[PDB]
Amino acid sequence: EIVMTQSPATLSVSPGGRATLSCRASQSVSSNLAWYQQKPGQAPRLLIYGASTRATGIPVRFSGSGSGTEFTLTISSLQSEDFAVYYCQQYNNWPTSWTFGQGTKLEIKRTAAAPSVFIFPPSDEQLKSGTASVVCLLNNFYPREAKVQWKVDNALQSGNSQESVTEQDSKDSTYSLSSTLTLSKADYEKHKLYACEVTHQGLSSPVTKSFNRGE
Amino acid sequence: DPKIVNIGAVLSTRKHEQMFREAVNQANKRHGSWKIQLNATSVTHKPNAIQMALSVCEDLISSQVYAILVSHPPTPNDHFTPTPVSYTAGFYRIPVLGLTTRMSIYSDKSIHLSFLRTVPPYSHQSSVWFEMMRVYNWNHIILLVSDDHEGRAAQKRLETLLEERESKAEKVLQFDPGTKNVTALLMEARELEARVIILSASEDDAATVYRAAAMLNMTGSGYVWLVGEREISGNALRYAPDGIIGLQLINGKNESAHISDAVGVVAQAVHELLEKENITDPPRGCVGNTNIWKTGPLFKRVLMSSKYADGVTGRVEFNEDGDRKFAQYSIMNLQNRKLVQVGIYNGTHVIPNDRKIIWPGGETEKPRGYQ
């Protein structure tokens, strides 16, 4: 009955800066809210309960306010370990209503880095089973927002491209993107030119890597 | 994570101690235990009145309780029972709730300085006499109260209520307590223009007065009596003239209900108080500490103004002295040696029943109470 909404969907900030997230109140929640901090792959933790009281064992940087009107928090003096997924929790008609939130995504701002574009043809062993795969690798680029296009004999390819993005590194906070194709042996041998086009903000011009089958 | 805030209870009848523990365990389930998880700590009564004080000091030291619940022992004498508890754990000014005691000395909030009650005292029934007086159209009453702190409170309350209406009572007699011969006072009330007689005395003295009046021809046909609750139960029941109108508190013995209500009220007060900074923990250690609890009167002030929503005994308010405002009563008549209920006192007015009433000496027709 109370849909939990936040703003914005995603937020990127530079190190040593503040961040403000607002969790919209769809109805008149008296004083109950709770913001959670979760690192990827780990269970969340408690930060605030009652919309004003800090959780025990938490640093004093975090704070918030709200008595039923668009509860908001203000984090200051942030460091590198911050910028995780932050949720909001309400409990008005507990223990029966229990409407959860969504959780905004946070990123750390960084300077643009030119991606390292690499391509990989099949190793002649996968083709024995009747399937061929082409791997295009992007290494140490920022931001993660990049466009990768596959050019098979100068033709647009769709519906057969899989992309995997690694999490931000703990050393340089970089991103990595890998493009994997899945095509049959007969289709693979019907074409000779396979190109991987990479478009990025840190590159003045798009980078395309192409190779010829059996060459 | 949560700070345990344990509360005590000196109630007897160990089964009732288990009941109190279950009550507090239910109490902390409804609210939650991420910030507050209130515990339980019970102890049983002791025969003498000094070891009781020593034991209550010991458990106060050992648990640093926030409030204490006190009930009645299984061997009556329920006047000096919660005397040591109030003195001992009011020296440090920590609240104490009385569950069943009805004596009127505890309403003096200067010798105890912290005593909340869940049952109205014996002097709060005088308003029922006034309301029934107004309803039945009697206006020439005689008081026959005793000489103690118990009769004086009732006479004071009735006198103020009467003077507020620009009326007066024909006389105010007073017999010394523990007397075995009272005939002069009965004769003095005998020669007069007043018929309504109102009693306020212990059961033994009530029996003596009933015997003296029965010896004379004073329980006749137009001598409508009026008594309270302590003059109907006990040895005074069988020595009673037919048609003696009396009252009785509707729920004054079901200790389970009072335990549950007190636990609920204390839990609400505790969960309400901690939403406030600058508080101090109670003085753990009864042998070293010598000072007043810093946030002592504040806890009493926040406790004495809590309107419990709905309980087994109903709404739980608190008169501005600490004794159970807005209680109910039941009116009975001694018909054929077996009391039968007639009417009820809803706390504001009197609702007559359908069962008819037999006045003294038969005479189903109402007596005017005058000559």
Binding site: - | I50, P84, I111, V287
Partner: protein
């Protein structure tokens, strides 16, 4: 030749023990045959755990028949413990100084606890007596929910018509300071009052707030010649800093009545009563050496002492107590507040006679 009457002198005020030891039993009562014993006990704790245990252990030590209690704190909850322990154990005890000298409303009807100090009615009587002398006839009273307020106004009303002088009373208040969020009502009520002479009734814990709000509103400039009882003053050496100049009050004599004199006269009263009863009836009560197990130790009632301890005179003084247990004939002094925040004595009142300067 009737020795061994047991009196214990409990000391908590940490005063000079030798100074009061030199006056505890220096005199030899050749008129009364009690030849009493005393035993000074010095403590530093005022907890109810230590008081009860100490008194019970002393009763178990050697057959003591009485106790005189002293104190230095202003605690109002030691008199109650003393009264209760004197009710359960029939040994009569007297409070002479400090926290055990604040008048309790009504003692346990089976108890023997006699204190030093004046009641509420006597304070009102002397307060009206000073008012009559300088002819400040018109007056008004404001009170709260405190002991004797009904008795205070009843004593005022009882003597207002038995005298031919024309008192003209106006206005009465019942409001108490325990109300929550009712400050607007109290402010309106105190702003309403404009009477020439006002007699207040409140205590320092609440009197601080009462004085603060009265000064904040502004009804404290010149014409507000307040008159207050002893308990408003509290401690002379300490001032709550509101205290409008011109305050007058009556307080028990605390400067010319030293601790040794109080100890001496308490021992004297107990010994005189015991010796008189011993001479008349030729027996003396003796409780068992069990403090806790007094349930069956009350076989011998000791109400004869209670009827023989309230009428005693010696050295030309009347030390007669009353049924409620107050002094019934104290010595009261009147003090005044000058420009500098300090109190100054003016006169002395004794035997219903006022002698001022």
């Amino acid at each position: 030749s009737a020795p061994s009457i047991g009196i214990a002198v409990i000391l908590v005020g940490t005063s000079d023990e030798v100074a009061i030891k030199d006056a505890h039993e220096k005199d030899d009562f050749h008129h009364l045959s009690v030849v009493p014993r005393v035993e000074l006990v010095a403590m530093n704790e005022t907890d109810p755990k230590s008081i009860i245990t100490r008194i019970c252990d002393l009763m178990s030590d050697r057959k003591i028949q009485g106790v005189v209690f002293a104190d230095d704190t202003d605690q109002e909850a030691i008199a109650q413990i003393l009264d209760f322990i004197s009710a359960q154990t029939l040994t009569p005890i007297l409070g002479i100084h400090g926290g055990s000298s604040m008048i309790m409303a009504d003692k346990d009807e089976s108890s023997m606890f006699f204190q030093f100090g004046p009641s509420i009615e006597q304070q009102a009587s002397v307060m009206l007596n000073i008012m009559e002398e300088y002819d400040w006839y018109i007056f008004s009273i404001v009170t709260t929910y405190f002991p004797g307020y009904q008795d205070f106004v009843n004593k005022i009303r009882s003597t207002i018509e038995n005298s031919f002088v024309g008192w003209e009373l106006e206005e009465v208040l019942l409001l108490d300071m325990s109300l929550d969020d009712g400050d607007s009502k109290i402010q309106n009520q105190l702003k309403k009052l404009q009477s020439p002479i006002i007699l207040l009734y409140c205590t320092k814990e609440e009197a601080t707030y009462i004085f603060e709000v009265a000064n904040s509103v502004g009804l404290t400039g010149y014409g507000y010649t307040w008159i207050v009882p002893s308990l408003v003053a509290g401690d002379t050496d300490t001032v709550p800093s509101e205290f409008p100049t011109g305050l007058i009050s009556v307080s028990y004599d605390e400067w010319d009545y030293g601790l040794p004199a109080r100890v001496r006269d308490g021992i004297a009263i107990i010994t005189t009563a015991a010796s008189d009863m011993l001479s008349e009836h030729s027996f003396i009560p003796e409780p068992k050496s069990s403090c806790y197990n007094t349930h069956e130790k009350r076989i011998y009632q000791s109400n004869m002492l209670n009827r023989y301890l309230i009428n005693v005179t010696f050295e030309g003084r009347d030390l007669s107590f009353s049924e409620e247990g107050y002094q019934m004939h104290p010595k009261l002094v009147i003090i005044l507040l000058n420009k500098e925040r300090k109190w100054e004595r003016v006169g002395k009142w004794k035997d219903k006679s006022l002698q001022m300067k």
